[PDB]
Amino acid sequence: IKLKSGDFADEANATTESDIEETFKRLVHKLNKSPEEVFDALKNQTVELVLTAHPTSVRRSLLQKHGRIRNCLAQLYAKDITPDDKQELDEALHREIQAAFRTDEIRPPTPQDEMRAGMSYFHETIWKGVPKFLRRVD
Amino acid sequence: VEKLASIDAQLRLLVPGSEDDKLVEYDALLLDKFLDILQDLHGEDLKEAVQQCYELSAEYEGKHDPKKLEELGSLLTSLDTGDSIVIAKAFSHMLNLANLAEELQIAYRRRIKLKSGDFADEANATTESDIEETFKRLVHKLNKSPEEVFDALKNQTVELVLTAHPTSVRRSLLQKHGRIRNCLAQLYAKDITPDDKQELDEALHREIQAAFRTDEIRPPTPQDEMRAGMSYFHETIWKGVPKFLRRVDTALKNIGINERFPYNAPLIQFSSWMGGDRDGNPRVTPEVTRDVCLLARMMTSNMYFSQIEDLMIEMSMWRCNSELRVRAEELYRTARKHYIEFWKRIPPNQPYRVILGDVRDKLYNTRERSRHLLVDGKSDIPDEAVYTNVEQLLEPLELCYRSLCDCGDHVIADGSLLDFLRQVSTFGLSLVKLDIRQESDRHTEVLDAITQHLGIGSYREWSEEKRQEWLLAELSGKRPLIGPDLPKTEEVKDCLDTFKVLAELPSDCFGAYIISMATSTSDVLAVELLQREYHIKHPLRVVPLFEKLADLEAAPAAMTRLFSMDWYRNRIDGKQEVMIGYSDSGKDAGRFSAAWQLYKTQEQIVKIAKEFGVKLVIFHGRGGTVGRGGGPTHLALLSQPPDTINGSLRVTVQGEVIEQSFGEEHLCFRTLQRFCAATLEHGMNPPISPRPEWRELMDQMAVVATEEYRSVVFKEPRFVEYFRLATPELEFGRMSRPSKRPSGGIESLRAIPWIFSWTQTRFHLPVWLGFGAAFKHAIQKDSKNLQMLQEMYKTWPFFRVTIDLVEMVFAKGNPGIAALNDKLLVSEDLRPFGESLRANYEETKNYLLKIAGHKDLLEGDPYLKQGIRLRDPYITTLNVCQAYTLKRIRDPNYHVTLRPHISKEYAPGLEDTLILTMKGIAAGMQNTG
Amino acid sequence: VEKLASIDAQLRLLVPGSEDDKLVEYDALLLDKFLDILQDLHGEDLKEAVQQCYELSAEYEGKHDPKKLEELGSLLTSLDTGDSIVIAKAFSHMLNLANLAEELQIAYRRRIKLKSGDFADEANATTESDIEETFKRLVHKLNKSPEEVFDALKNQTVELVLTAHPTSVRRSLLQKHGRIRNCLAQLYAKDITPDDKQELDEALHREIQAAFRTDEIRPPTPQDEMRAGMSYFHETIWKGVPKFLRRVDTALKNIGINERFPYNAPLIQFSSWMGGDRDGNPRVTPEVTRDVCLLARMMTSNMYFSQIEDLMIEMSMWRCNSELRVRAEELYRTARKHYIEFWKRIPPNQPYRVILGDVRDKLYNTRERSRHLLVDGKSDIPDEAVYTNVEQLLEPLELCYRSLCDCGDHVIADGSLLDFLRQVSTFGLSLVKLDIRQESDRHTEVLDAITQHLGIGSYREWSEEKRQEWLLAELSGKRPLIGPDLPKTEEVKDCLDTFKVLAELPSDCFGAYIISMATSTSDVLAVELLQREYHIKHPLRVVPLFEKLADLEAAPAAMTRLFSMDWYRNRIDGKQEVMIGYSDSGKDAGRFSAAWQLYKTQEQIVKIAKEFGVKLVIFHGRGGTVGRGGGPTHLALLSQPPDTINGSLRVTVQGEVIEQSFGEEHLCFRTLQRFCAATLEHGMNPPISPRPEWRELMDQMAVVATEEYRSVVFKEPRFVEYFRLATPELEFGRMSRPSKRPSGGIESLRAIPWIFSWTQTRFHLPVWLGFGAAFKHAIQKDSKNLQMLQEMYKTWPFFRVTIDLVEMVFAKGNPGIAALNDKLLVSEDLRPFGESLRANYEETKNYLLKIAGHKDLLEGDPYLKQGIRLRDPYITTLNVCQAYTLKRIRDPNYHVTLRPHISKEYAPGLEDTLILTMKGIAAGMQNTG
Ligand SMILES: O=P(O)(O)OC[C@H]1O[C@H](O)[C@H](O)[C@@H](O)[C@@H]1O
Ligand SMILES: O=P(O)(O)OC[C@H]1O[C@H](O)[C@H](O)[C@@H](O)[C@@H]1O
């Protein structure tokens, strides 16, 4: 949403919540902080995310299939897309679902593997995510 | 290649920019095209002169450097009468363009899809509820059945009373405004050819010029001023109404009602003051009133007539029920044409056409009788040949309609035929009904003549109890009061003749008789008696308008007494309408105290009507939050005290708002929409009632505000000299109508002038004065009040709506203009008095902000703010031009070196330049108080 | 949720689908909405019956299983008269829908951006050249200066002659077709609300039903049939022309001409046969002709009149030149109103309005005089009060125009005023000029009466040389030929009275006097003489129409002789028009030999006119490639022999093509556009001249083709019995007008009937017969001819255009229908004769393919093919229904078990069902021969 009520309720929903710039601006304009003070607060801020193990947790292979499926799907919905590319993305999609469905072996796994799991999600997303976000801060 | 991108760039600076936000582009293009035109017609030299003014005004609007204002002064004041006229025209015309662009932007701005559900959402067009959403809220959030909603609606009436523009535009020029707005709309459509673009370009360029060159120098008669109106209806409302009612139909489908809104349910009704309101206005004679009825009757017949021919073509069907087939045969049988579409006879082979042909002739005749009556005074044309009553015109249409359904063709019947039924039913034989308004003292003058001529003393000298006793006696009198040989002053004759006119004309021409400056039971009986004297068969309902605060405080007693009288209870037949006027009452006691008092008065009068079994309608005169137009009207209506609408809304649509409200089909539609939706919702979902703490604080603030307002306006003896100097008020007073009802003083001055004078000046005193004292005193008495005030702004619609309006005005305000005025026009001894008022402006504004919880004006409403920021430079140029012109007019010996004449070409004076200026500013400011 | 996606799915099967290709969706929606309507009105049961027929026809159109056709037969033939009427209406109505959808698809299909430059590109709307592209080609590819192009154009005339629909639709029903087409257009626009969609849906649904229920059972008078026309012009051409001329203006900008196309340059002119053509048609009396002139005059005045009021409102300007200011003063001075917009007097404050008010009154009067003359016969109204000549009406508009420019407002002057000037100048006082046509033998009959009554012998008995000698003598005779007391048969009186009518009426009503069945110099002189006898002040130009091949071969000698006569050379004043008729000539000798002969005849007559200093105009009668409408017309015009247009085009717009060409604003515009562009290009860029080998082969093929055509049609004695049986020709002949000029035989039968009979039947014999013999013989004589023929198809526009038309017809052909017909209607002894013709169909088609280098019909033109494939199932159902109906009519004793009645509701027979059928098929087939 482009114009937001300004109520704190807006921050409970992804479509209305504030991104970093809007937050800075609220702080500067609605709260009389100088850019320098905000920048300074931020420079000294730490956010630590502690990752716990899935209480039931999924395979690095299967993750990537989930990703491939999610991308195929994302791509099928784009204008300026050929009958052929659509046809080929279709079979790509169809194929990657099956590949996931057929990755279903019956087993316990060691803490080492359960953790070697983690080192995936970071590869997959956080490792690239962090620079992207910090550049947005910039 | 590109003048535009630069003009766009320099327009963006004024308001930073986004998606469907084309306003700056729109304004840029229009401005760029308009400049070229100035160049062609008046020469490079002048074009630059115009740009310079703009650049300066814009530079000023950003920083607010009083230097810029002076540079602007040096420029404007150095122009001969000829060139200043041109600049004044130019800026005055760029404004109208900027408004069209804004109409268009507003029309196509995207609705927000998911809404908070807060009542605040109803104050803005993007977030407010359409009719379906309203139905759904009522059904789901409020446990009403579809049937109950449908039922409420079926019984609901919404009456919009049209008043004359207080400065008003030409039917030609309207249509140019439309054409320009359409060309513009069309230039922004994808899948558009280079050629079509090129051709639309020149179409646009051409239509701006055509408007610019429609600028002749003038007064016009009430008849023409009204014949104006009959345009806007053609242009937009006539079509709007069916479109909206069809939407009601669709909305009813979607909540599970499987039938259309009855075509004869009088949901929407229109009315007018034009030729009706004679309060402090002797130009509005009886003959005027007779003429506006006949015009209305005529034009309406003409409208029905010019579209009947299209319905006739559409109605090519031959399968009908017998009821119809008979009546067709009859009509062909009775046959043996001035116009041409169907200039022939018609085979009963096609019966629907036969009926509609008769209808056409009857409509033509009805048109012609009204035409001859209007120009001759007699007309040799039988009532048989003509519609004297709307039922007569509906009947054949209902016939066709039924026939179609019966033959299995309801689907066809619900097309144009239905639209036509709805039009007929909404607009009747007279597009608008006319209200009559005259001030109480006049009826007194008349009765006094009568009593004195009868030898029984002086009605004027009698006490209220006596007047009532006498009036009731004569209301059952067994012999007339009035002879032909009664001595009459011109005023008394004028007043009595108005009743002769009311008796002679068909009653479907008229609405209410409003009594201006009402104060008592006798005031209303007086009018009842004179109606009886003239044996008016269907007397108009009498509507007191209570203006001054005291008159408001006395109203309940007056209404109670009325309702206590059997004579009266039985005449009004369960229905009373009372009028109120925000501007009027606020001229007496300040806007704040007037707002609050009106809330309470309505509450009390509602309670009183309830007790006596009377359905009470409150007619909202001008000045309300409720006459703002746009979304704010939506919330304003929902903000009304509980049970004050009760299925029947009646509101003034102020002339200075008719364009915004109706001039563009989408806005027209949404205007109609919100009036209908809000009215409906309110009866089933009133706003919360104020907490007693709030009443208590509001009462406390009212006293202080009224004290401040009166201190400054009435008590301070310097004030009128200030007003007379700092303000074009005197010059306005050499006009619309006498703005002083020659008595002297502000209490004597009428409200429109009062509001208008200070609007010209961008200072707006009448709207905010007293809010500051009230706020300051309440906070200084107790800092916890700030919290209370804020809770009130957050939670109490009335309060919110009341503060938003004042906020909007401050956004259109600029005290620098007021300051310049002081410096140019006001004597050295009165400047500190001005400074003092500007100080109060600021302090009031700041409290108002603190209460709404905003840093800047209109944080809640960026779109509105953008609209204003864009208009401003143009207005500023007019203010400045105006100020110096006022100087030159007032001071025969002020002179400065004039620049050699700048305009080319290939008698007018200062007064003309001033008018241009007064009208540009007024159209840039739209509504305020 | 979804009947539609399925109906879409089953419609796709018929033609595989893409981008802006909405046709299948459009057709699907329309069909789905139409079915619901059949359900509401007639019941599930019937709806299914209709679907079944469709499913069968569709299944048939895909595979071509004769079984399907029979299943369909079993169904259709088992329906009582009542139900078959309904099905016939239904399919006949789904066709009209399918055509609207196609109009819309054609209107919005995307232009190709980069074009090959081949002349083939001009045969298709997506690739053909608009006016600007044409200018540019001429300037850049052909070294013409802008000035030369502009100049050519300024002198160019394009005359479109409108003929009556050979079966013609109602002004009401047109407008429904428009409304349906618009609702549809609107349903496909993004940024469209759920509500608007919902409401447009019901609007659509409603307007289809309204059309479906406008279906009353009939003959109508020439007057009404013509009063039809005055619709299409209102609807589309009246507005179209200014729109196009403004595009010409824009196109001229973009090649550097800095002025607009002169508003009085007669670029576009319209004409009509309605009430004019009396050839083999005694219903078209003199009185008819007098009436169509007066109607024309009336309605035209009315059109100018209903828009003047809008121009008057627009012309609010007050600044004028003196020339105007005088004339305004004069007019206000001379003042002291039936209608209402301006029912008042007007201040000279606004002078443009004063003029235009006068103009309005004069237009009204002109309307009224024509109205009274029309219904009474006298009218007491002075020529002074009225426009008797277009200059009189232009003058005040030119005045306003000039005034505006002079005051600096040309930009405004080039808006509606200009459009109005252009309309006036294009349409004059009579929207169309009327051509008169009568057959030569009639003039002979008249002259014979005269000569015999004079006692000098028998004009009929005289030799050509004698007739000429006598005619010239009497053309300079010193005393009248004709007494009031001359013995006259009804025909001779009818013919003579036509000239009395031509003399009495204003000459701006009339165009040409066409002589049907012309063959000689005397034929034209005869008409000249009778015009002199009736002292017609401005005689109409005489235009021989040479029909039969022999008559074409003799035409050059006849024209040469005419041009040799001083009497004649001096009367025609440098200008001769000659008519030709593709269908007519092709009825004599086959389409092929007629095409070729007409190429040569034009060449020779051009050469002959050039030699005598005569500007020759060739009036294209019906049947051409050039009367196809759409792009193909574009190339057809460019394909004409060199110097045959020379700045003046005159072509018939066949009734069965007027809807496609004009009924939709975009197609209207492009029709006008290509006619103007092609005409312009041709005079500066003729097609290549045929190589002598090509002439030689074409001559050789012509003989063979004519031999085959005549062998089958005239020489074979079995043919007429075949025709009479295999074809609704006889039943058509109990109607428009007598299709046999009672003489007996094909040579006697008129061409429209000839074409139409075989079109109904999907077999189209008149269009292709003889092409096969010609092709086969040329290839069998020498296989290298195939190559030559192909080079001709690739390189010779005439040839290409000639083959494309025949190809298009084969695409609308289906020999199975012809085969079914044989089996149902034709006796056992004639079936092998049918088989033989079907064999010739196939063989002709296959050669035609081999020559165009296509595997399948219309490879070059998928869009056209798609249009046809979609229509077909509907047509097929009509063919089958038709066939059995023809059986039941012809055979009182053929009966089959009728299904119990299927339609519900909530006197008609077979003949009625047959008409429905004849008209559905005809509207599905549009133009062929
Ligand atoms: O306000 P006045 O100067 O009396 O002028 C006219 C106006 O007056 C009142 O306030 C009424 O409430 C309005 O319906 C009207 O437009
Ligand atoms: O062809 P006919 O049966 O004579 O009927 C009328 C037609 O005839 C000719 O071919 C003409 O060339 C046309 O302008 C006309 O539409």
List own/partner pairs for B48-56 with CB under 8 A and 24 or more apart: B49/B75, B49/B79, B49/B83, B49/B87, B49/B902, B50/B87, B50/B90, B50/B91, B53/B87, B53/B91, B53/B877, B54/B91, B54/B873, B54/B874, B54/B877, B55/B10, B56/B877
**Alpha carbon nearest to ligand 1 atom 7, residue:** B622
Shortest distance between the Cα of B353 and any Cα of chain C, in A, equals 12
Tell me the C-alpha distance between C266 and C155, whole Å.
8
User: Rounded to an integer, what is the distance from CA B855 to the centroid of its chain?
Assistant: 32
Centre of ligand 2 to C-alpha B355, Å, is: 41
Beta strands B510-518 and C510-518 are unpaired
Amino acid at position B145, single letter: S
Centre of ligand 1 to C-alpha B581, Å, is: 7
Residue A3 forms contact with B (CB below 8 Å): yes
Residue C20 forms contact with B (CB below 8 Å): no
Output the DSSP codes for B704-761. Answer: HHHHHHHIIIII-TTHHHHHHHSSTHHHHT-----SB----STTTB-HHHHHHHHHHT
Q: Greatest CA span in chain C, whole angstroms? A: 88
Tell me the C-alpha distance between B123 and B630, whole Å.
8
**Tokens 């063959």 appear where?**
C519
Centre of ligand 2 to C-alpha B719, Å, is: 91
Residue B20 forms contact with A (CB below 8 Å): no
C144 lines ligand 2 (CB under 6 A): no
Query: Residue C818, SS3?
Result: helix
Residue C409 forms contact with B (CB below 8 Å): yes
* Tokens describing residue B543: 């509507």
CB contact under 8 A, A1 and B112: yes
Residue B307 forms contact with C (CB below 8 Å): no
CB C821 within 8 A of CB C730: no
Task: Determine the length of chain B.
Answer: 929
Considering only alpha carbons, which residue of chain A is nearest residue B113? Answer: A1
C581 lines ligand 2 (CB under 6 A): yes
Residue B114 forms contact with C (CB below 8 Å): no
| Residue B902 main-chain phi, psi, to 5 deg | -110, -40
Shortest distance between the Cα of B175 and any Cα of chain C, in A, equals 8
Q: Which atom from ligand 1 is nearest to the alpha carbon of B750?
A: 3
Other CB atoms closer than 10 Å to residue A38's CB: what's the count?
Answer: 16
Output the DSSP codes for B229-291. Answer: HHHHIIIIIHHHHHHHHHHHHHHHHTTT--SPPPTT---EEEEE-TTTB-TT-TT--HHHHHH
Output the DSSP codes for C117-185. Answer: -SGGGGGSTTTS--HHHHHHIIIIIT---HHHHHHHHHT-EEEEEE--------HHHHHHHHHHHHHHH
Q: Which of B114, B118, B862 sits opposite A3 (nearest CB)?
A: B862
Break positions in chain A: residue before each gap, C to N over 2.5 angstroms: 56, 107
**Tokens 């932007």 appear where?**
B105
CB contact under 8 A, B408 and C40: yes
Tell me the C-alpha distance between B266 and B288, whole Å.
28
Shortest distance between the Cα of B565 and any Cα of chain C, in A, equals 50
Chains that touch B (3 or more CB pairs under 8 A): A, C
**Alpha carbon nearest to ligand 1 atom 11, residue:** B621
Q: Which of B112, B116, B855 sits opposite A29 (nearest CB)?
A: B855
* Tokens describing residue C325: 């200011």
* Tokens describing residue C296: 């024309």
**Alpha carbon nearest to ligand 1 atom 6, residue:** B752
CB A68 within 8 A of CB A100: no
Tell me the C-alpha distance between C86 and C581, whole Å.
38
Dihedral angle, C-alpha C253, C257, C263, C268, nearest 10 °: -80
Task: Write out residues 118-137 of B within 8 Å (CB-CB) of A.
Answer: 118
Which numbered ligand comes closest to the C-alpha of B748?
A: 1
Output the DSSP codes for C695-733. Answer: HHHHHHHHHHHHHHHHIIIII-TTHHHHHHHSSTHHHHT
Closest residue by Cα to residue C634 from C594, C587, C681: C681
> Which residues of B participate in catalysis according to the annotation?
165, 587, 628
Break positions in chain B: residue before each gap, C to N over 2.5 angstroms: 17, 167, 218, 336, 735, 741, 906
Experimental approach: X-ray
Tell me the C-alpha distance between B702 and B590, whole Å.
9
Residue A29 forms contact with B (CB below 8 Å): yes
Top mutation candidate among B159, B160, B162, B163 for ligand 1, by most atoms within 8 Å of CB: B163
Q: Which atom from ligand 2 is nearest to the alpha carbon of C652?
A: 14
* Tokens describing residue C93: 């109505």
Query: Which of C374, C411, C418 is the mutation pick for testing B, counting most B CBs within 10 A?
Result: C411
Considering only alpha carbons, which residue of chain C is nearest residue B251? Answer: C195
Shortest distance between the Cα of C125 and any Cα of chain B, in A, equals 16
Q: Which of A5, A29, A30 sits opposite B116 (nearest CB)?
A: A5
CB contact under 8 A, C209 and B411: yes
Tell me the C-alpha distance between B589 and C669, whole Å.
66
Beta bridge partners of B433: B271
CB C156 within 8 A of CB C269: no
Amino acid at position B706, single letter: T
Chains that touch C (3 or more CB pairs under 8 A): B
Residue B411 forms contact with C (CB below 8 Å): yes
User: Rounded to an integer, what is the distance from CA B801 to the centroid of its chain?
Assistant: 18
Amino acid at position C718, single letter: R
Chain B contact set for A29 (CB, 8 A)? 855
State whether the Cα torsion C607-C612-C613-C616 is positive or negative. Answer: negative
Tell me the C-alpha distance between B562 and B569, whole Å.
7
Buried/exposed code over C410-436 (b: 16+ C-beta within 10 A; e: otherwise): bbbbbbbbbbbbbbbbbbbbbbbbbbb
Closest residue by Cα to residue B761 from B671, B858, B882: B882
Chains that touch A (3 or more CB pairs under 8 A): B
Tell me the C-alpha distance between B609 and B605, whole Å.
6
Where does B62-170 show beta strands of DSSP type E? 157-162
Break positions in chain C: residue before each gap, C to N over 2.5 angstroms: 17, 167, 218, 336, 735, 741, 906
The alpha-carbon radius of gyration of chain A (Å, integer) is 21
Tell me the C-alpha distance between B837 and B78, whole Å.
30
Q: So where are chain C's domains?
A: 1-120+165-218+692-929, 121-164+219-691
Q: At what angle do helices C797-811 and C631-639 cross, to 10 degrees?
A: 150
Centre of ligand 1 to C-alpha B675, Å, is: 20
DSSP state of C538: S
First to last CA, chain A: 23
Beta strands C433-439 and B433-439 are unpaired
Closest residue by Cα to residue B662 from B222, B157, B296, B174: B174
CB contact under 8 A, C906 and B408: yes
